Design an enzyme around this catalytic site. Structure first.
Site, PDB file in Angstrom:
ATOM      1  N   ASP A  88      54.836  93.012  43.068  1.00 20.89           N
ATOM      2  CA  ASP A  88      54.700  92.524  44.439  1.00 20.89           C
ATOM      3  C   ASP A  88      56.101  92.358  45.025  1.00 20.89           C
ATOM      4  O   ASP A  88      56.654  91.260  45.095  1.00 20.89           O
ATOM      5  CB  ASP A  88      53.907  91.219  44.466  1.00 20.89           C
ATOM      6  CG  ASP A  88      53.401  90.866  45.852  1.00 20.89           C
ATOM      7  OD1 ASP A  88      54.112  91.136  46.842  1.00 20.89           O
ATOM      8  OD2 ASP A  88      52.284  90.314  45.952  1.00 20.89           O
ATOM      9  N   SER A 143      55.126  82.916  51.592  1.00 19.56           N
ATOM     10  CA  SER A 143      55.198  84.269  51.060  1.00 19.56           C
ATOM     11  C   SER A 143      56.625  84.782  51.185  1.00 19.56           C
ATOM     12  O   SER A 143      57.188  84.804  52.285  1.00 19.56           O
ATOM     13  CB  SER A 143      54.231  85.198  51.796  1.00 19.56           C
ATOM     14  OG  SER A 143      54.300  86.516  51.280  1.00 19.56           O
ATOM     15  N   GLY A 144      57.206  85.191  50.060  1.00 20.17           N
ATOM     16  CA  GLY A 144      58.580  85.637  50.030  1.00 20.17           C
ATOM     17  C   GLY A 144      59.605  84.535  49.882  1.00 20.17           C
ATOM     18  O   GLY A 144      60.786  84.769  50.172  1.00 20.17           O
ATOM     19  N   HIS A 202      52.259  92.215  49.131  1.00 20.00           N
ATOM     20  CA  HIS A 202      50.848  92.068  49.470  1.00 20.00           C
ATOM     21  C   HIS A 202      50.653  91.671  50.928  1.00 20.00           C
ATOM     22  O   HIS A 202      49.607  91.970  51.514  1.00 20.00           O
ATOM     23  CB  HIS A 202      50.185  91.044  48.548  1.00 20.00           C
ATOM     24  CG  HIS A 202      50.687  89.647  48.734  1.00 20.00           C
ATOM     25  ND1 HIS A 202      51.823  89.174  48.115  1.00 20.00           N
ATOM     26  CD2 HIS A 202      50.200  88.616  49.465  1.00 20.00           C
ATOM     27  CE1 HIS A 202      52.017  87.913  48.458  1.00 20.00           C
ATOM     28  NE2 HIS A 202      51.047  87.550  49.277  1.00 20.00           N
TER      29      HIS A 202
END
Ligand SMILES: *[C@@H]1O[C@H](CO)[C@@H](O[C@@H]2O[C@H](CO)[C@@H](O[C@@H]3O[C@H](CO)[C@@H](O)[C@H](O[C@H]4O[C@H](CO)[C@@H](O)[C@H](O)[C@@H]4O)[C@@H]3O)[C@H](O)[C@H]2NC(C)=O)[C@H](O)[C@H]1NC(C)=O
Ligand SMILES: *[C@@H]1O[C@H](CO)[C@@H](O[C@@H]2O[C@H](CO)[C@@H](O[C@@H]3O[C@H](CO)[C@@H](O)[C@H](O[C@H]4O[C@H](CO)[C@@H](O)[C@H](O)[C@@H]4O)[C@@H]3O)[C@H](O)[C@H]2NC(C)=O)[C@H](O)[C@H]1NC(C)=O
Ligand SMILES: *[C@@H]1O[C@H](CO)[C@@H](O[C@@H]2O[C@H](CO)[C@@H](O[C@@H]3O[C@H](CO)[C@@H](O)[C@H](O)[C@@H]3O)[C@H](O)[C@H]2NC(C)=O)[C@H](O)[C@H]1NC(C)=O
Ligand SMILES: *[C@@H]1O[C@H](CO)[C@@H](O[C@@H]2O[C@H](CO)[C@@H](O[C@@H]3O[C@H](CO)[C@@H](O)[C@H](O)[C@@H]3O)[C@H](O)[C@H]2NC(C)=O)[C@H](O)[C@H]1NC(C)=O
Ligand SMILES: *[C@@H]1O[C@H](CO)[C@@H](O[C@@H]2O[C@H](CO)[C@@H](O)[C@H](O)[C@H]2NC(C)=O)[C@H](O)[C@H]1NC(C)=O
Ligand SMILES: *[C@@H]1O[C@H](CO)[C@@H](O[C@@H]2O[C@H](CO)[C@@H](O)[C@H](O)[C@H]2NC(C)=O)[C@H](O)[C@H]1NC(C)=O
Ligand SMILES: *[C@@H]1O[C@H](CO)[C@@H](O[C@@H]2O[C@H](CO)[C@@H](O)[C@H](O)[C@H]2NC(C)=O)[C@H](O)[C@H]1NC(C)=O
Ligand SMILES: *[C@@H]1O[C@H](CO)[C@@H](O[C@@H]2O[C@H](CO)[C@@H](O)[C@H](O)[C@H]2NC(C)=O)[C@H](O)[C@H]1NC(C)=O
Ligand SMILES: CO[C@]1(C(=O)O)C[C@H](O)[C@@H](NC(C)=O)[C@H]([C@H](O)[C@H](O)COC(C)=O)O1
Ligand SMILES: *[C@@H]1O[C@H](CO)[C@@H](O)[C@H](O)[C@H]1NC(C)=O
Ligand SMILES: *[C@@H]1O[C@H](CO)[C@@H](O)[C@H](O)[C@H]1NC(C)=O
Ligand SMILES: *[C@@H]1O[C@H](CO)[C@@H](O)[C@H](O)[C@H]1NC(C)=O
Ligand SMILES: *[C@@H]1O[C@H](CO)[C@@H](O)[C@H](O)[C@H]1NC(C)=O
Lengths: 236, 354, 271
Positions: free
Chosen positions: A90, A186-187, A41
Site C-alpha cells: 500500500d 491515511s498516509g 488504497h
C-alpha cells in the site's frame, strides 16, 4: 490521533495534506520537491486521476487552507503488486508540476538506508489530521503523539492478528490502548529519531478501532519498498 | 534445702502438643490458635520441640523468661526446601506476598523446628470461596509435598468465568466457550469486532491469562497482595478453558483442573525430617494471666527447714511415714491446737511428719 | 436486669407469675448438715471450737428456681430474685434426673456471683455439664437477659448468657466431678477480707473445700439463671427444679472428729 498534544509550528515540516473536492481527505510525506508519498488504497479508482487533487504544504491549520495552494498533482504512480481484498504493498507516489520551494518551516524527510539496526521497542512519532472520538468529525490543526514499535511475532499472535501481517508491514502503538491512530489518517508519516536524523519507516495503511486495546495500528514497511521508489524516481 | 509447694490455679498451656501435631498445614492453610489464661515453661518447650533457631523482633528474648502476657497467638506452617529464604523479615518473595506476611510493627518471635517425617502428613486445602464455587477439588499431588501460592487474585460477588450463549453463538471466528452461569452475576465481557474482511471477529477479556495479561485494566480479576492476617484470595483462572462450546444455557460453568494457574509445590523432607515455621505474637507486656514459670523454684525432692507448704511457713524436720486419713482435698495435718504436724506432697503422694 | 449487653431479643413478655416459696425444712447441724471442713486441714479424734461463717440453727429456706418455655419475664431478673450477697449463702440443690432412651442425665440450675456484671469486673459462674462441674470467675460480658438450656431434650432457645468472641482475662479455672445418681447437693459460699471461698458435697455430709481467690473487691449480688427446657414441665415428666438458699453469718460451732477425720457431731452453741 487520540491522546496527542497539538504540534507547534515548525515541528514536523513534512505534513502534506491532499485536498480532493475542495476538502482534505488524506495526508502524505514529502521526500523530494517532485514526489509525495502516501497510501495507495485511497488513490484507487475512480479517484485514480492525475487532476482533481490539490496539495497544501506548510499550512499549520485548516483555517488558512483555502483556494490557492501548491501546484497541480501530476500522474499518480501506485505499486502494481497492490491488492484490494488482501492488504499488501500500500504505497502510492504523487508528483507535483512545480518544484516544492523549501520555505522556513519546510524540510523533507530522509529515506532509510538499507540497514539501520532498529531497536525492537523504539520510540517513534505519528502526526496527522485525524479524530479523537467515535470516528470523529474532522481536524483543524496538527495533532501528534509518540508510540512504540511492536515486535512482529508478538503482533501476529492469535489474540492480536491471526496471520494477517505480511513481511512488508509493521505494528506500532500501545497494547494497553488509549493511544492510536483513527480514520482519516491515511498516509500519516511515521518518523523516528536515530543519530540526530529523522527517518520515515511507516505508512498508515489499515487498522481496527481507535485507541482500543488488543488492536494496534498497522503501518506499511517502507524499507522493503525503497527499491521501487528509487526505480520510479530513476524512470521518471 | 528450702521447700516450696503450691497448687496452681490455671491449667497448663500444652503448646508442645499442638506444635507436635502430625497434621502439618501448608503455607496456604496456615493455622492460628490463641493461648490465654495458662502457664508454660519456655525452656522446656524449646527442649521438647527440637529448635534450630529462635529470634524475636522488637523484643528481647531475655525478657520472655518470667513475664506475663494477656494472650499469645501462634501461626505455623511447613517450609518448602527451595523458598526457605523468603521467610526473612522484609522480602519481596512469593511466600510473604501470597501466603503469609510477617508483621514487623509489633513484638513477635520466630521459631524454626523439625519433626520426624515418618509420621508427618501434609493437609493441602484451598481457602478460596470463589475458586471452590466453580469446581475446585483436592490437589492430589504426593505425600510430604507442600503447596505455596505465587500470584493472588481477588474478585467481587459478580464474577462468572463464562460467556453468554447468545453472544457466543453469533461468532464465526474465535468462538469463546459459553455455558449457564448461576443466578445473579455479570457475564464475561465479549464484543464482536469487524476487520478488513472478517465481519465476525469476537474478542473477549483477560487474554491470554491474568498472569501475563496485555492490559490489566480490562480484566475482571485483579492481582492483590495478602495483608497482615489474611489468606490468599485465590489462584488465577484461565477463562479460555472454562465451560463448554455451544451450551444451550443448561450446563454449569466448571473450569478444568488445568485452568488454575499461579501455584507450585515442593518437598519438605531434609535428613528424614520436615521443617516447620512458627511465629509467636505477644499481646500485652507485664500485664495478663499467661505467665512463665522459668523463674520459679522447681518442686525439688523433700530431703527427709525453711518450707512454704500451701501458704504455711516455718522450719522443722521431715520423716516419711504412711497415712491413710488424707483425702483428695486434704494436704495439711494440724494438731488439736492450731499447729501443723504433717503434710502430703501432691507430686509424689508421700506423707511426712513435721 | 443483671447485665448490659443486648445479646438477644426473641420473646420477652411481662407477667407476674412467680413468688419464692418458704421451705418447711429446718436446719439441723447435730449430725453435720450445714458445716464444712477447713480448707486444707486434718484433725484426728479431737473437739474444736471454730468461729466461722455458718448458717443459723432453725432457719427457713427460700426457693429461687426459674423454669420456662420459650418465654422470659422481665420481673425474673429483678428483686427479690436478685438478692444481696452480704456475707454468704448456704444452698441445697435438687439433682433433676432425665432419661433419654434409658440413659440417665443430671442437670440443675447455675448460679452467678458478681458486683456489676460488666466486663470491667470479675464475675463467678458455676455451671454443671452432666457430671462435671465448671467454675470460671472471669470477666464476662453478661447478657442483659441470660438463661441456660438443657442439653438432653433441648429447648426452643439457645444458651446465651455471655457474648465473648475470645476468652477474656480469668483468674481461676478448674473442673470438678460429682456423683450423677445423687438426689441432693449442698454448697457453701462466703467472702472474708477480700478472699472468696467455695464448698460442695454430694451427700448428706459436711462439704468439701473447692478453692480460694483473692479479689479485693466486695461481692454484693448473686443470681440464679433460669433454665429453659421442654421436659421438666409438669405435663410430660412431673419433675421440678428446686434451689433453696439460706443466709450465712459469723457464729461459733463445736466440731467433733473421729479417729479417721470424719465429723460426727456439731453444736451451734447459740440455740
Ligand atoms: C464490654 O461491654 C460493653 C458493654 O456496653 C461493650 O460495649 C458495647 O459494645 C457493643 C458492640 O460493639 C455496642 O453495640 C453497638 O453499638 C453501636 C452504637 O455505639 C450500634 O450502632 C451497633 O449496632 C450495630 O449492630 C446491630 C446488631 O447488634 C445492628 O442491628 C446495627 O444495624 C448496627 O450494625 C451495636 O449495637 C454497644 O453499643 C457497646 N455499649 C456501650 C455502652 O458502649 C464492649 O464492647 C465490651 N468490651 C469488649 C472488649 O467486649
Ligand atoms: C470442663 O468441662 C467442660 C465440659 O465438659 C469443658 O468444655 C469442653 O471443652 C472441649 C475442649 O475445648 C470442647 O470441645 C471443643 O468443642 C468445639 C466446639 O465448641 C470444637 O470445635 C473443638 O474441636 C477441637 O478438637 C477437634 C478434635 O476433637 C479438632 O479436630 C478441632 O480442630 C478443634 O481443635 C472441641 O471439640 C467442648 O465443646 C467443651 N464443652 C462445653 C460444654 O463447653 C472444659 O474444657 C473443661 N475444662 C477443662 C479445664 O478441662
Ligand atoms: C522450666 O524449665 C527449665 C528448663 O528445663 C528448668 O530449669 C532447668 O533446671 C535444671 C535443674 O537445675 C538445670 O540443669 C542444670 O544445668 C546446668 C547447665 O546449664 C548444669 O551445670 C547443672 O548441673 C544442672 O544440670 C537447667 O539448666 C535449667 N534450665 C535453664 C534454662 O535454666 C526449670 O526448673 C523449669 N521450671 C519449672 C517450674 O518446671
Ligand atoms: C451416687 O448416689 C447414689 C444414690 O445415693 C448411690 O447409690 C446408693 O448406694 C448406697 C450404698 O450402696 C445404697 O445404700 C444401700 O442400699 C441397699 C439397697 O439397694 C441396702 O440394702 C443397703 O442397706 C444400703 O442402704 C443406696 O440404696 C443407693 N441408692 C440408689 C438410689 O441406688 C451411689 O452409690 C453413689 N455413687 C457412689 C460412687 O458412691
Ligand atoms: C509414628 O511413630 C510411632 C512411634 O514412633 C510408630 O509406631 C511404631 O511402629 C513400629 C513399626 O510400625 C513398631 O515396631 C513400634 O512398636 C511402634 N511404636 C509404637 C509406640 O506404636 C509409627 O509406626 C509411626 N508411623 C508410621 C506411619 O510409621
Ligand atoms: C496421687 O494420688 C492421686 C489420687 O488417687 C492420683 O490421682 C488419680 O490418678 C489416676 C490415674 O491417673 C486417675 O485415674 C484418678 O482419676 C486420679 N484421681 C484424682 C482424684 O485425681 C494421682 O495420679 C497420684 N499421683 C501419682 C504420681 O501416683
Ligand atoms: C440458635 O442457633 C442456631 C444456629 O446458629 C440458629 O439457626 C440459624 O438461624 C439463622 C436465622 O434464620 C439462619 O440464618 C441460620 O442458617 C441458622 N443456622 C443453622 C445452623 O440452622 C437459631 O436461629 C438460633 N435460635 C435462636 C432462637 O436464636
Ligand atoms: C403428673 O401427676 C398428675 C397428678 O397425679 C397426673 O394426673 C393424673 O393423671 C391420671 C391419668 O391420666 C388421672 O387419672 C388423674 O385424674 C390425674 N390427676 C390429676 C390431679 O389431674 C399426671 O398424669 C402425671 N403426669 C404423668 C406424665 O404421668
Ligand atoms: C407450666 O408452666 C411453666 C412451664 O411451662 O413448665 C411452669 C411454671 O408455671 C412457670 N415457671 C415459673 C418459674 O414461673 C412457667 C411460666 O411462668 C409460664 O409458662 C409463663 O411464662 C411467662 C414468662 O409468663 O411455665
Ligand atoms: C490422583 O492422581 C493420580 C496420578 O495422576 C491418579 O492416578 C489418581 O486417580 C488421582 N486420584 C484422584 C482422586 O484424583
Ligand atoms: C442442552 O440443550 C441442548 C438443546 O436442547 C441439548 O442438545 C443438550 O444436550 C442439552 N444439554 C444438557 C446438559 O442438558
Ligand atoms: C437489641 O438488638 C436487636 C438487634 O440488633 C434490636 O432489634 C433491638 O431493638 C435491640 N434492643 C435494645 C434494647 O437495644
Ligand atoms: C405478684 O403477685 C403476687 C400475688 O398477688 C403479689 O404478692 C406480688 O406483690 C406481685 N408482684 C409484683 C411485682 O407486683
Amino acid at each position: 490521533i487520540v491522546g496527542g498534544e497539538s504540534a507547534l509550528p515548525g515541528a514536523w515540516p513534512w505534513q502534506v495534506s491532499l485536498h480532493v473536492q475542495n476538502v482534505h481527505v488524506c495526508g502524505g510525506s514529502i521526500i523530494t520537491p517532485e514526489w509525495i508519498v502516501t497510501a495507495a488504497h485511497c488513490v484507487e479508482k475512480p479517484l485514480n486521476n492525475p487532476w482533481h487533487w490539490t496539495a497544501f504544504a506548510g499550512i499549520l491549520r485548516q483555517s488558512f487552507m483555502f483556494y490557492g495552494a501548491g501546484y497541480q498533482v501530476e500522474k499518480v504512480i501506485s505499486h502494481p503488486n497492490y491488492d484490494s481484498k488482501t492488504k499488501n504493498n500500500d504505497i502510492a507516489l504523487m508528483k507535483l508540476q512545480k518544484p516544492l520551494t523549501f520555505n522556513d518551516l519546510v524540510k523533507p524527510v530522509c529515506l532509510p538506508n538499507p540497514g539501520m539496526m532498529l531497536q525492537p521497542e523504539q520510540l517513534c512519532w505519528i502526526s496527522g489530521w485525524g479524530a479523537t472520538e467515535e470516528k470523529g468529525k474532522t481536524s483543524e490543526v496538527l495533532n501528534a503523539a509518540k508510540v512504540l514499535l511492536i515486535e512482529t511475532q508478538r503482533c501476529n499472535s492469535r489474540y492480536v492478528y491471526d496471520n494477517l501481517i505480511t513481511p512488508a508491514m509493521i505494528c506500532a502503538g500501545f497494547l494497553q490502548g488509549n493511544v492510536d491512530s483513527c480514520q482519516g489518517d491515511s498516509g500519516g508519516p511515521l518518523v523516528t529519531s536515530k543519530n540526530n536524523i529523522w527517518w520515515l519507516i511507516g505508512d498508515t495503511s489499515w487498522g481496527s478501532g481507535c485507541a482500543k486495546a488488543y488492536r494496534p495500528g498497522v503501518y506499511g514497511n517502507v524499507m522493503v519498498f525503497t527499491d521501487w521508489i528509487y526505480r520510479q524516481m530513476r524512470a521518471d | 534445702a528450702t521447700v516450696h509447694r503450691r497448687i496452681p490455679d490455671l491449667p497448663d498451656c500444652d503448646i508442645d502438643k499442638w506444635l507436635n501435631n502430625f497434621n502439618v498445614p501448608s503455607p496456604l492453610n496456615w493455622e492460628r490458635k490463641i493461648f490465654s489464661n495458662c502457664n508454660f515453661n519456655l525452656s522446656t518447650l524449646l527442649r521438647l520441640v527440637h529448635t534450630d533457631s529462635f529470634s524475636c523482633n522488637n523484643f528481647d528474648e531475655s525478657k520472655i523468661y518470667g513475664s506475663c502476657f494477656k494472650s499469645i497467638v501462634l501461626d505455623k506452617f511447613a517450609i518448602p526446601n527451595s523458598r526457605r529464604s523468603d521467610l526473612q523479615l522484609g522480602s519481596s518473595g512469593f511466600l510473604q506476598s501470597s501466603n503469609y506476611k510477617i508483621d514487623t510493627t509489633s513484638s513477635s518471635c520466630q521459631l524454626y523446628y523439625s519433626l520426624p517425617a515418618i509420621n508427618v502428613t501434609i493437609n493441602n486445602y484451598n481457602p478460596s470461596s470463589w475458586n471452590r464455587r466453580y469446581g475446585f477439588n483436592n490437589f492430589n499431588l504426593s505425600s510430604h509435598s507442600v503447596v505455596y501460592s505465587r500470584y493472588c487474585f481477588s474478585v467481587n460477588n459478580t464474577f462468572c468465568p463464562c460467556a453468554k450463549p447468545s453472544f457466543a453463538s453469533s461468532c464465526k471466528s474465535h468462538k469463546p466457550p459459553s455455558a449457564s452461569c448461576p443466578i445473579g452475576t455479570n457475564y464475561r465481557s465479549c464484543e464482536s469486532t469487524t476487520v478488513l474482511d472478517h465481519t465476525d471477529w469476537c474478542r473477549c477479556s483477560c487474554l491470554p491469562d491474568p498472569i501475563t495479561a496485555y492490559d490489566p485494566r480490562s480484566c475482571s480479576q485483579k492481582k492483590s497482595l495478602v495483608g497482615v492476617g489474611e489468606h490468599c484470595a485465590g489462584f488465577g483462572v484461565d477463562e479460555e478453558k472454562c465451560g463448554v462450546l455451544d451450551g444451550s444455557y443448561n450446563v454449569s460453568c466448571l473450569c478444568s483442573t488445568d485452568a488454575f494457574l499461579g501455584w507450585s509445590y515442593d518437598t519438605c523432607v531434609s535428613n528424614n525430617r520436615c521443617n516447620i515455621f512458627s511465629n509467636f505474637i505477644l499481646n500485652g507486656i507485664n500485664s495478663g494471666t499467661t505467665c512463665s514459670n522459668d523463674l520459679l523454684q522447681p518442686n525439688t525432692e523433700v530431703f527427709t527447714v525453711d518450707y512454704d507448704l500451701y501458704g504455711i511457713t516455718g522450719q522443722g524436720i521431715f520423716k516419711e511415714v504412711s497415712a491413710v486419713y488424707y483425702n483428695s482435698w486434704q494436704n495439711l495435718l494440724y494438731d488439736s491446737n492450731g499447729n501443723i504436724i504433717g503434710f502430703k506432697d501432691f507430686v509424689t503422694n508421700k506423707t511426712y511428719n513435721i
